[PDB]
Amino acid sequence: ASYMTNSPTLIVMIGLPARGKTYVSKKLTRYLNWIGVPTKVFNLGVYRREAVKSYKSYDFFRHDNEEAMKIRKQCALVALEDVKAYLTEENGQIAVFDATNTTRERRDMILNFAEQNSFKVFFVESVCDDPDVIAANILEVKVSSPDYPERNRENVMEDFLKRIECYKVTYRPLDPDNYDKDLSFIKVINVGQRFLVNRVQDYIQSKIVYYLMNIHVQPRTIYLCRHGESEFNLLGKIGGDSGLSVRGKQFAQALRKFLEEQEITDLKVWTSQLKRTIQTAESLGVPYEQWKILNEIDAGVCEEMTYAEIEKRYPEEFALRDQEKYLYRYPGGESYQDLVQRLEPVIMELERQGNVLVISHQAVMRCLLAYFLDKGADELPYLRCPLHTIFKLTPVAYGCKVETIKLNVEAVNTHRDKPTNNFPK
Amino acid sequence: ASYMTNSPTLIVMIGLPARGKTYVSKKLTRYLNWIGVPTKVFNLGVYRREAVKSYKSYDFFRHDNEEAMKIRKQCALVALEDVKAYLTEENGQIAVFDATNTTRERRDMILNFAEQNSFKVFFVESVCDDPDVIAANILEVKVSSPDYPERNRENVMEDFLKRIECYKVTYRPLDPDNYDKDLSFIKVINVGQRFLVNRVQDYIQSKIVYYLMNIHVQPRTIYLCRHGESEFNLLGKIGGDSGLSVRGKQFAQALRKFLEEQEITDLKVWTSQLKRTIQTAESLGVPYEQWKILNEIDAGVCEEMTYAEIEKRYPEEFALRDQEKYLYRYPGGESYQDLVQRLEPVIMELERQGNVLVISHQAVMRCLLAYFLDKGADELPYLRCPLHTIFKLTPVAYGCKVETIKLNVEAVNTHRDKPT
Ligand SMILES: Nc1ncnc2c1ncn2[C@@H]1O[C@H](COP(=O)(O)OP(=O)(O)OP(=O)(O)O)[C@@H](O)[C@H]1O
Ligand SMILES: Nc1ncnc2c1ncn2[C@@H]1O[C@H](COP(=O)(O)OP(=O)(O)OP(=O)(O)O)[C@@H](O)[C@H]1O
Ligand SMILES: O=P(O)(O)OC[C@H]1O[C@](O)(CO)[C@@H](O)[C@@H]1O
Ligand SMILES: O=P(O)(O)OC[C@H]1O[C@](O)(CO)[C@@H](O)[C@@H]1O
């Protein structure tokens, strides 16, 4: 009177080692938080390493190893108690349980935990049988996984290959035709070549599946920059549709040279529909695609004004925006929250693809950086993205490599800091 | 070909007769237009009926009926030419091709058309093998399909069953393991019990899959009404959080009696978080759920004012809102477009479920009616939803049955027409 319509959700990863589970867990968790759903990942690798206080050879992972199996089960129970605390005491809505969970006994233990606590359960099983995908994932584990010592990885590969065989002995995949016909799940096959989806129960499960249709697990690189310096940038005017300054044109030429030197396979170039990004791309000698949704934030009645003019003409609005820069909405225009919402299709295409250069704008690029660098709404409107600097991004399971490349053309500074040190607040 | 990320897309239905193809095509097309992607459905049943100028017995659908096969192929080619015009001359972005397309030869013809025109292709194959799902779909065809004469349907079932057998003879399903491993598609199995998705190539294909995870094909009924009359309604005041007038409470009591008479299985009742909808649901004697996203449109600095007061205090804003009521945003508040965007999770849950009563508000309910009755943004802010009237909606493939039930409790009129 009522029942289970308002329950939180436990997303349970399944798979053999080196299947992309931790990458998927982390990026899915970031996406769910991005759309406003409080979500936390629980990485059982961390739990078990902290419990045994040493790195473990493949024999630790034998299903026969009674002593190891008992330690590993206890770690799962501790993590589940942390899941419960998060979802019932800490205002979490979704918990993501990143572990192998390859046996039916372990999955039934999780399901019984969820039923006792009225948590919905959705399984994400990563199945890789393509030799190239497998060999790639395994090599990535060998090089970067923290489940082995930081240095001296010469014997990691041989051990890890044997650890996988231990899991293969007892692995029961989800069986949609019989044993698991009533469970809600998705099998992600070969990191997203195809999918088997069973019994999607509700809106949030549809969003989870939606996100996983856009994820890309193999290493990829994306490039972000602004249009070259514009005339309005030189004037300190926001918004508008002005063209490149002569220095912005020099930047566009330098950008062409930089892209040639980078030797990028199958480069795609995306711009907005505003002249300054188009003009930047036109100098590159390669096809490009304009996106309306990459247009700069709309400043409404403040379009084409300087900050000094805005503070003078609209002192109350100007102070409000400084107090609440993410949520503030220009009269007749947009807030950063509005901008975030309309950027979602570009963000999904950038989750999917590598070798894309996005030529956009200060506020737009802040949103894209906040998404791929996992920054919150508080910091998002203040992220620094100078004119004539390229951001080169390589996402990894626990974050994103960022390289900045300042090209050799000067530009004005358009970054206004939040006012500091004022009294009262 | 697919050389651009935002090139046009041809969605191609596949399946035997009575698989929900035509319902899925139409509801997906409506959803795509709702989120701003111009989409048009092409119903090959209509093309072929118009060309052959008569109803056809199962004999027409034999794969070995050479003369019929040639006509059917020519209809597919005509429809593809209309697809081309829609996507290249009329600024369409997605075309939905509703046909059986059960043979590899027909699918290859479509694929070659798409490649010649640089259209992306995504197939939606409806596979039904559950006897209950099939039997239901077939009876629905028997009752309502326009592929048979309107009256005297006594021989329809026998003919239609033989027509299905004609198609079973040559049906080749999509084969993800070999023949069709490089095609982009979703198999919808038993109208959404489960799905097989292959090679999603872009954002919009992921949105198509997303929508299909929420669709419900079997007939269902949902109920929409407003909160009972509020004190602010009696005062002509917009917005706010006032409670029910005594007539709104009387309506809530009448609503309980109405719901009992409807003999509804597993009724769900959804309200907003505002007092007037909660108090309406509380008279019903059943569990109900509050949704913040069902709260009435936010009028910002005009909250709790009458239209006359708004016109006096903010004449320019009042006139702008009349010129552009869908997009206009109240200072400090919302536009109908904002309202549409935040309603998406409840719209998806209403696509999925039946036996739901939503008790909401004038602007909210306009958005929900615009979605399920396929109304455009121009008309959405002016749809009429009187206090104390229940809208009973039964979606069908070509629209929605609508019954309005005025309960016997008077209420003020809160509907303001656009000035002439
Ligand atoms: N706690 C962590 N901190 C940083 N990176 C991590 C962490 N856990 C996993 N990763 C990264 O996840 C990837 C896979 O290593 P993990 O140690 O998760 O191996 P695995 O579980 O066998 O593989 P997978 O999770 O891909 O199925 C590596 O890139 C690794 O650096
Ligand atoms: N042109 C139309 N106008 C109104 N309703 C239609 C039209 N075409 C199909 N429908 C509806 O679609 C549903 C299925 O009928 P249809 O004629 O499409 O049979 P079918 O193609 O064998 O079945 P399905 O499309 O479900 O595979 C029925 O409710 C029918 O009324
Ligand atoms: O939110 P902020 O810090 O005002 O930055 C966005 C502004 O920056 C610019 O891209 C450059 O000044 C303007 O066009 C835009 O209004
Ligand atoms: O968009 P309209 O026609 O002003 O209707 C919305 C108004 O209707 C009401 O629901 C009832 O007057 C108000 O609370 C709301 O502001």
Short mmCIF file of C-alpha atoms in Angstrom, two decimals, chain A:
data_model
loop_
_atom_site.label_atom_id
_atom_site.label_comp_id
_atom_site.label_asym_id
_atom_site.label_seq_id
_atom_site.Cartn_x
_atom_site.Cartn_y
_atom_site.Cartn_z
CA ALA A 1 0.00 0.00 0.00
CA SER A 2 2.10 0.71 -2.15
CA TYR A 3 5.14 -1.46 -3.07
CA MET A 4 8.29 -1.48 -5.22
CA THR A 5 7.81 1.39 -7.73
CA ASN A 6 10.21 3.66 -5.78
CA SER A 7 13.08 1.23 -5.27
CA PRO A 8 16.72 1.93 -6.08
CA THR A 9 18.58 -0.27 -8.56
CA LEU A 10 21.61 -2.52 -8.18
CA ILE A 11 23.45 -3.00 -11.48
CA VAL A 12 25.51 -6.20 -11.36
CA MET A 13 28.45 -6.72 -13.72
CA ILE A 14 29.18 -10.27 -14.92
CA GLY A 15 32.10 -11.64 -16.87
CA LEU A 16 35.45 -13.34 -17.11
CA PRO A 17 38.53 -11.18 -16.49
CA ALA A 18 39.66 -8.79 -19.21
CA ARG A 19 36.14 -8.20 -20.52
CA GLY A 20 35.93 -4.44 -20.08
CA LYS A 21 33.81 -4.73 -16.93
CA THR A 22 35.56 -2.02 -14.94
CA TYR A 23 35.64 0.47 -17.85
CA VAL A 24 31.93 -0.12 -18.52
CA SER A 25 31.13 0.18 -14.79
CA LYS A 26 32.93 3.51 -14.43
CA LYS A 27 31.68 5.19 -17.59
CA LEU A 28 28.10 4.03 -17.00
CA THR A 29 28.35 5.37 -13.44
CA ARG A 30 29.56 8.74 -14.75
CA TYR A 31 26.71 8.93 -17.29
CA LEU A 32 24.05 8.16 -14.68
CA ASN A 33 25.37 10.87 -12.38
CA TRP A 34 25.47 13.22 -15.38
CA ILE A 35 21.74 12.81 -15.96
CA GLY A 36 21.10 13.47 -12.26
CA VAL A 37 20.80 9.97 -10.83
CA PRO A 38 23.09 9.52 -7.76
CA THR A 39 25.18 6.46 -8.60
CA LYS A 40 28.27 4.82 -7.10
CA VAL A 41 30.53 2.01 -8.30
CA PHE A 42 31.82 -0.76 -6.03
CA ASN A 43 34.99 -2.36 -7.36
CA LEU A 44 35.52 -5.78 -5.81
CA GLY A 45 39.12 -5.86 -7.01
CA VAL A 46 39.79 -3.03 -4.57
CA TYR A 47 37.94 -4.81 -1.76
CA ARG A 48 39.81 -8.08 -2.17
CA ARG A 49 43.27 -6.48 -2.60
CA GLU A 50 42.71 -4.46 0.58
CA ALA A 51 41.59 -7.62 2.38
CA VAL A 52 44.49 -9.92 1.42
CA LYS A 53 47.07 -7.08 1.54
CA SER A 54 49.17 -8.65 -1.25
CA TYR A 55 49.12 -9.47 -4.95
CA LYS A 56 47.82 -12.94 -5.67
CA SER A 57 48.93 -15.55 -8.19
CA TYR A 58 46.45 -17.55 -10.25
CA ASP A 59 46.09 -20.34 -7.68
CA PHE A 60 44.26 -17.89 -5.40
CA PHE A 61 41.45 -17.91 -8.03
CA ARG A 62 40.88 -21.69 -8.27
CA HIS A 63 37.27 -22.56 -7.56
CA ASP A 64 38.75 -25.44 -5.42
CA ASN A 65 40.75 -23.19 -3.16
CA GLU A 66 38.48 -23.37 -0.13
CA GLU A 67 40.45 -20.76 1.79
CA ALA A 68 40.51 -18.30 -1.08
CA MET A 69 36.85 -18.87 -1.96
CA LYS A 70 35.89 -18.05 1.64
CA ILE A 71 37.88 -14.78 1.60
CA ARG A 72 36.41 -13.79 -1.77
CA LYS A 73 32.84 -14.52 -0.60
CA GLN A 74 33.37 -12.42 2.50
CA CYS A 75 34.56 -9.51 0.33
CA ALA A 76 31.39 -9.73 -1.76
CA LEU A 77 29.30 -9.60 1.45
CA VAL A 78 31.21 -6.56 2.73
CA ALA A 79 30.70 -4.75 -0.57
CA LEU A 80 27.00 -5.60 -0.51
CA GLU A 81 26.72 -4.10 2.97
CA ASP A 82 28.38 -0.97 1.57
CA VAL A 83 25.86 -1.02 -1.30
CA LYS A 84 23.02 -1.16 1.24
CA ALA A 85 24.46 1.71 3.24
CA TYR A 86 24.86 3.81 0.09
CA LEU A 87 21.33 3.21 -1.19
CA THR A 88 19.48 3.52 2.13
CA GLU A 89 21.59 5.83 4.29
CA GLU A 90 23.56 8.02 1.83
CA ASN A 91 20.78 8.96 -0.65
CA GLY A 92 22.13 6.85 -3.50
CA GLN A 93 19.75 5.69 -6.22
CA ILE A 94 21.90 3.25 -8.23
CA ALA A 95 24.76 1.04 -7.13
CA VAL A 96 27.09 -0.59 -9.67
CA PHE A 97 28.70 -3.82 -8.48
CA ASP A 98 31.86 -4.47 -10.50
CA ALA A 99 33.01 -8.09 -10.10
CA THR A 100 33.16 -11.29 -12.15
CA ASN A 101 30.03 -12.92 -10.61
CA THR A 102 30.40 -15.79 -13.07
CA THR A 103 28.68 -18.54 -11.04
CA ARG A 104 24.98 -19.04 -10.39
CA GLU A 105 25.59 -19.40 -6.65
CA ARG A 106 27.16 -15.94 -6.41
CA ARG A 107 24.40 -14.40 -8.54
CA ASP A 108 21.73 -16.02 -6.36
CA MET A 109 23.41 -14.62 -3.24
CA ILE A 110 23.24 -11.15 -4.80
CA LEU A 111 19.62 -11.64 -5.85
CA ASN A 112 18.66 -12.74 -2.34
CA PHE A 113 20.42 -9.70 -0.91
CA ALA A 114 18.47 -7.44 -3.28
CA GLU A 115 15.10 -9.06 -2.52
CA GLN A 116 15.59 -8.74 1.25
CA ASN A 117 16.25 -5.01 0.76
CA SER A 118 13.72 -4.30 -2.02
CA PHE A 119 16.40 -3.34 -4.52
CA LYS A 120 15.73 -3.85 -8.21
CA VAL A 121 18.48 -5.80 -9.99
CA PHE A 122 19.77 -5.38 -13.54
CA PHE A 123 22.70 -7.51 -14.79
CA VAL A 124 25.28 -6.33 -17.37
CA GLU A 125 27.18 -9.35 -18.70
CA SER A 126 30.21 -8.69 -20.85
CA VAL A 127 30.84 -11.65 -23.19
CA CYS A 128 33.95 -11.50 -25.37
CA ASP A 129 34.71 -14.33 -27.76
CA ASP A 130 36.39 -12.33 -30.56
CA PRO A 131 40.13 -13.17 -30.36
CA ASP A 132 41.23 -9.64 -31.28
CA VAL A 133 38.99 -8.02 -28.64
CA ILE A 134 40.16 -10.57 -26.06
CA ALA A 135 43.85 -10.20 -26.89
CA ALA A 136 43.50 -6.41 -26.77
CA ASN A 137 41.73 -6.41 -23.36
CA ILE A 138 44.28 -8.85 -21.92
CA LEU A 139 47.19 -6.73 -23.07
CA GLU A 140 45.60 -3.73 -21.40
CA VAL A 141 45.31 -5.68 -18.14
CA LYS A 142 48.96 -6.74 -18.43
CA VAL A 143 50.15 -3.15 -18.88
CA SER A 144 47.88 -1.16 -16.58
CA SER A 145 45.80 -3.32 -14.19
CA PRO A 146 46.44 -2.56 -10.48
CA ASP A 147 45.75 -6.18 -9.66
CA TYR A 148 49.47 -6.76 -10.32
CA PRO A 149 52.61 -5.00 -9.00
CA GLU A 150 53.28 -1.56 -10.44
CA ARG A 151 56.73 -2.56 -11.70
CA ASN A 152 58.20 -5.84 -13.02
CA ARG A 153 55.25 -7.09 -15.10
CA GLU A 154 57.39 -9.61 -17.01
CA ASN A 155 55.46 -12.58 -15.62
CA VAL A 156 52.02 -10.93 -15.39
CA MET A 157 50.80 -12.21 -18.76
CA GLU A 158 51.55 -15.89 -18.07
CA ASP A 159 49.91 -15.71 -14.63
CA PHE A 160 46.87 -13.77 -15.84
CA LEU A 161 46.24 -16.21 -18.67
CA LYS A 162 46.12 -19.01 -16.07
CA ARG A 163 43.85 -16.94 -13.81
CA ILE A 164 41.32 -16.66 -16.68
CA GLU A 165 41.35 -20.44 -17.09
CA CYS A 166 40.41 -20.77 -13.40
CA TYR A 167 37.28 -18.72 -14.00
CA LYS A 168 36.42 -20.58 -17.20
CA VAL A 169 36.06 -23.83 -15.25
CA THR A 170 32.94 -22.66 -13.39
CA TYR A 171 31.61 -19.82 -15.59
CA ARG A 172 27.87 -20.15 -16.25
CA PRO A 173 26.75 -17.38 -18.61
CA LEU A 174 23.26 -15.95 -18.22
CA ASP A 175 20.80 -18.34 -19.88
CA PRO A 176 17.86 -16.36 -21.34
CA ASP A 177 16.09 -19.48 -22.55
CA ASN A 178 15.76 -21.19 -19.19
CA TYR A 179 17.61 -20.61 -15.91
CA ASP A 180 17.60 -16.80 -16.23
CA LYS A 181 14.52 -16.20 -18.42
CA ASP A 182 12.92 -14.06 -15.69
CA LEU A 183 15.99 -11.92 -14.90
CA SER A 184 16.45 -8.40 -16.25
CA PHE A 185 19.77 -8.14 -18.06
CA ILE A 186 21.83 -7.18 -21.07
CA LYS A 187 24.64 -9.25 -22.56
CA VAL A 188 27.19 -6.87 -24.12
CA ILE A 189 28.90 -8.99 -26.75
CA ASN A 190 32.45 -8.17 -27.93
CA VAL A 191 32.38 -4.79 -26.17
CA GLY A 192 29.32 -3.68 -28.06
CA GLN A 193 29.27 -5.32 -31.46
CA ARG A 194 25.89 -6.70 -30.43
CA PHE A 195 23.61 -7.11 -27.46
CA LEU A 196 21.00 -9.48 -26.02
CA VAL A 197 18.49 -7.61 -23.81
CA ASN A 198 16.02 -9.52 -21.59
CA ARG A 199 13.03 -8.19 -19.63
CA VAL A 200 13.67 -4.45 -19.38
CA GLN A 201 11.36 -3.48 -16.51
CA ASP A 202 11.30 0.30 -16.35
CA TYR A 203 12.53 3.65 -17.61
CA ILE A 204 15.90 3.59 -15.90
CA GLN A 205 16.74 0.13 -17.27
CA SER A 206 15.93 1.50 -20.74
CA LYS A 207 18.37 4.37 -20.10
CA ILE A 208 21.07 1.94 -18.99
CA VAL A 209 20.66 -0.05 -22.21
CA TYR A 210 20.59 3.19 -24.20
CA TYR A 211 23.89 4.31 -22.72
CA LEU A 212 25.55 0.93 -23.38
CA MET A 213 24.54 1.21 -27.07
CA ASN A 214 26.83 4.25 -27.26
CA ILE A 215 29.81 3.09 -25.16
CA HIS A 216 33.20 2.35 -26.70
CA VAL A 217 35.66 0.31 -24.65
CA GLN A 218 38.80 0.17 -26.82
CA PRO A 219 41.26 3.08 -26.29
CA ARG A 220 40.34 6.16 -28.32
CA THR A 221 41.39 9.80 -28.57
CA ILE A 222 39.27 12.92 -29.05
CA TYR A 223 40.43 16.49 -29.65
CA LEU A 224 38.63 19.60 -28.46
CA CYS A 225 39.34 23.25 -29.20
CA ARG A 226 37.60 26.53 -29.69
CA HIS A 227 37.17 28.42 -32.87
CA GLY A 228 40.17 30.64 -33.55
CA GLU A 229 40.01 34.08 -31.96
CA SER A 230 37.00 36.05 -33.16
CA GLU A 231 36.41 39.75 -33.62
CA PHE A 232 33.99 39.76 -30.72
CA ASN A 233 36.62 38.06 -28.58
CA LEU A 234 38.92 41.05 -29.33
CA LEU A 235 36.07 43.39 -28.33
CA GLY A 236 35.20 41.48 -25.15
CA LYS A 237 31.66 40.87 -26.45
CA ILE A 238 29.84 37.64 -25.63
CA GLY A 239 27.70 35.66 -28.03
CA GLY A 240 26.98 36.83 -31.54
CA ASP A 241 28.09 35.43 -34.85
CA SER A 242 31.29 37.36 -35.64
CA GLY A 243 34.07 36.01 -37.87
CA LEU A 244 37.69 35.16 -37.12
CA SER A 245 40.20 37.87 -36.32
CA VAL A 246 43.39 37.75 -38.35
CA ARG A 247 44.93 35.88 -35.45
CA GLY A 248 42.02 33.39 -35.46
CA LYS A 249 42.79 32.76 -39.13
CA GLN A 250 46.46 32.16 -38.26
CA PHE A 251 45.32 29.70 -35.61
CA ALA A 252 43.23 27.86 -38.17
CA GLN A 253 46.33 27.50 -40.38
CA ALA A 254 48.39 26.29 -37.46
CA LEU A 255 45.62 23.82 -36.58
CA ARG A 256 45.88 22.33 -40.05
CA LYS A 257 49.61 21.83 -39.57
CA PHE A 258 49.08 20.31 -36.14
CA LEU A 259 46.52 17.85 -37.48
CA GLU A 260 48.81 16.78 -40.32
CA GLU A 261 51.64 16.17 -37.84
CA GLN A 262 49.36 14.10 -35.61
CA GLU A 263 48.77 11.60 -38.48
CA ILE A 264 45.18 10.88 -37.49
CA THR A 265 43.37 8.01 -39.18
CA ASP A 266 39.84 8.79 -40.41
CA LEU A 267 39.71 12.21 -38.78
CA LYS A 268 36.24 13.67 -38.37
CA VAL A 269 35.80 17.40 -37.75
CA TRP A 270 32.67 18.76 -36.07
CA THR A 271 31.82 22.44 -35.82
CA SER A 272 28.86 24.51 -34.74
CA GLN A 273 26.74 26.53 -37.18
CA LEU A 274 28.40 29.78 -36.13
CA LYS A 275 30.78 31.42 -38.61
CA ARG A 276 33.81 31.40 -36.33
CA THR A 277 33.94 27.58 -35.97
CA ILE A 278 33.07 27.03 -39.65
CA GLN A 279 35.84 29.40 -40.73
CA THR A 280 38.26 27.53 -38.49
CA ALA A 281 37.41 24.18 -40.13
CA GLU A 282 37.39 25.59 -43.67
CA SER A 283 41.17 26.09 -43.41
CA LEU A 284 41.84 22.42 -42.62
CA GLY A 285 41.42 20.90 -46.09
CA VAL A 286 39.16 18.09 -44.90
CA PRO A 287 35.40 17.58 -44.81
CA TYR A 288 33.59 18.76 -41.72
CA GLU A 289 30.11 18.58 -40.25
CA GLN A 290 28.16 21.44 -38.68
CA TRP A 291 25.98 20.82 -35.62
CA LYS A 292 23.35 23.30 -34.46
CA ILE A 293 23.59 21.82 -30.96
CA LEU A 294 27.27 22.84 -30.76
CA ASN A 295 26.28 26.53 -31.00
CA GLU A 296 27.55 28.61 -28.11
CA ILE A 297 25.36 29.27 -25.08
CA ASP A 298 22.60 31.79 -25.85
CA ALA A 299 22.91 34.93 -23.74
CA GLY A 300 19.44 36.29 -24.55
CA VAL A 301 19.13 40.02 -24.05
CA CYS A 302 22.85 40.09 -23.15
CA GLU A 303 23.98 38.81 -26.57
CA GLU A 304 26.83 40.94 -28.02
CA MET A 305 27.47 42.84 -24.78
CA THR A 306 30.63 42.97 -22.71
CA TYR A 307 30.61 41.86 -19.09
CA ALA A 308 31.15 45.49 -18.04
CA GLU A 309 28.14 46.58 -20.09
CA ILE A 310 26.06 43.75 -18.60
CA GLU A 311 27.02 44.61 -15.01
CA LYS A 312 26.17 48.26 -15.74
CA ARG A 313 22.83 47.65 -17.48
CA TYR A 314 21.68 44.60 -15.41
CA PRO A 315 23.54 44.73 -12.08
CA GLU A 316 21.07 42.42 -10.34
CA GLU A 317 21.19 39.78 -13.09
CA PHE A 318 25.00 40.02 -13.23
CA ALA A 319 25.34 39.35 -9.50
CA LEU A 320 22.84 36.49 -9.68
CA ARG A 321 24.82 34.73 -12.36
CA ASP A 322 27.99 35.01 -10.27
CA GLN A 323 26.14 33.44 -7.32
CA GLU A 324 24.68 30.53 -9.34
CA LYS A 325 26.51 30.28 -12.65
CA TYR A 326 25.41 26.73 -13.54
CA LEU A 327 21.68 27.24 -13.01
CA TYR A 328 21.34 30.94 -13.90
CA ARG A 329 19.39 31.51 -17.10
CA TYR A 330 19.91 34.62 -19.16
CA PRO A 331 16.63 36.48 -19.79
CA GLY A 332 15.62 35.24 -23.23
CA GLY A 333 18.52 32.82 -23.30
CA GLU A 334 20.07 29.75 -21.77
CA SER A 335 21.69 28.39 -18.65
CA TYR A 336 24.55 25.93 -18.57
CA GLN A 337 21.96 23.33 -17.57
CA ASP A 338 20.07 24.06 -20.81
CA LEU A 339 23.36 23.70 -22.70
CA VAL A 340 24.14 20.37 -21.06
CA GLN A 341 20.73 19.03 -22.05
CA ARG A 342 21.01 19.91 -25.71
CA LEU A 343 24.55 18.53 -25.97
CA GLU A 344 23.62 14.96 -25.08
CA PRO A 345 23.61 13.66 -28.70
CA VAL A 346 27.13 15.03 -29.29
CA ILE A 347 28.28 13.57 -26.00
CA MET A 348 26.90 10.14 -26.96
CA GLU A 349 28.67 10.30 -30.33
CA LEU A 350 31.89 11.22 -28.54
CA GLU A 351 31.48 8.24 -26.16
CA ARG A 352 31.22 6.03 -29.24
CA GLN A 353 33.95 7.40 -31.53
CA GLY A 354 37.60 8.28 -31.56
CA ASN A 355 39.58 10.46 -33.95
CA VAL A 356 37.10 13.34 -33.76
CA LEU A 357 38.05 17.02 -33.48
CA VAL A 358 35.26 19.21 -32.08
CA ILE A 359 35.72 22.91 -32.85
CA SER A 360 33.27 24.74 -30.60
CA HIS A 361 33.05 27.51 -27.99
CA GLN A 362 33.95 28.36 -24.41
CA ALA A 363 30.73 27.29 -22.65
CA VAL A 364 30.12 24.30 -24.95
CA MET A 365 33.63 23.01 -24.49
CA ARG A 366 33.35 23.37 -20.70
CA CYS A 367 30.37 21.02 -20.79
CA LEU A 368 32.19 18.47 -22.94
CA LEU A 369 35.26 18.60 -20.68
CA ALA A 370 33.11 18.25 -17.57
CA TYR A 371 31.53 15.12 -19.03
CA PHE A 372 34.71 13.38 -20.18
CA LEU A 373 36.82 14.53 -17.20
CA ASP A 374 34.07 13.80 -14.62
CA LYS A 375 33.69 17.33 -13.25
CA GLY A 376 30.65 18.45 -11.30
CA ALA A 377 28.18 21.19 -12.12
CA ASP A 378 29.87 23.48 -9.56
CA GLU A 379 33.18 23.44 -11.44
CA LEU A 380 31.80 23.03 -14.97
CA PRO A 381 31.09 26.74 -15.73
CA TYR A 382 34.62 27.65 -14.58
CA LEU A 383 36.69 25.07 -16.44
CA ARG A 384 39.53 26.78 -18.33
CA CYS A 385 39.70 26.34 -22.13
CA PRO A 386 41.90 29.02 -23.70
CA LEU A 387 41.66 30.12 -27.30
CA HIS A 388 44.28 28.47 -29.55
CA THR A 389 44.85 25.49 -27.25
CA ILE A 390 44.01 21.92 -28.25
CA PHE A 391 42.79 19.47 -25.61
CA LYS A 392 43.74 15.90 -26.44
CA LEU A 393 41.73 13.36 -24.44
CA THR A 394 42.22 9.60 -24.04
CA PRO A 395 39.58 8.15 -21.66
CA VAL A 396 40.60 5.22 -19.41
CA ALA A 397 38.64 3.10 -16.89
CA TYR A 398 39.56 5.43 -14.00
CA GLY A 399 39.48 8.84 -15.66
CA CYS A 400 40.91 10.43 -18.77
CA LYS A 401 44.38 11.31 -20.01
CA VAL A 402 44.50 15.02 -20.94
CA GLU A 403 47.25 16.66 -22.99
CA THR A 404 47.06 20.38 -23.85
CA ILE A 405 48.84 21.77 -26.90
CA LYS A 406 49.15 25.53 -27.14
CA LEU A 407 49.58 26.48 -30.79
CA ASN A 408 51.89 29.38 -31.51
CA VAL A 409 49.34 32.14 -32.16
CA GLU A 410 48.40 34.67 -29.48
CA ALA A 411 44.79 35.31 -28.45
CA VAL A 412 42.93 37.33 -25.86
CA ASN A 413 41.78 35.79 -22.57
CA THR A 414 38.00 35.33 -22.34
CA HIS A 415 37.97 33.52 -18.98
CA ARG A 416 36.27 35.47 -16.17
CA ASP A 417 36.90 34.06 -12.68
CA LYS A 418 34.19 33.94 -10.06
CA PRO A 419 34.59 37.06 -7.87
CA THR A 420 36.57 36.28 -4.77
CA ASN A 421 37.04 37.53 -1.20
CA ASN A 422 33.84 39.58 -0.92
CA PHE A 423 31.88 40.20 2.28
CA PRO A 424 29.28 38.96 3.50
CA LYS A 425 29.33 35.41 1.98
#
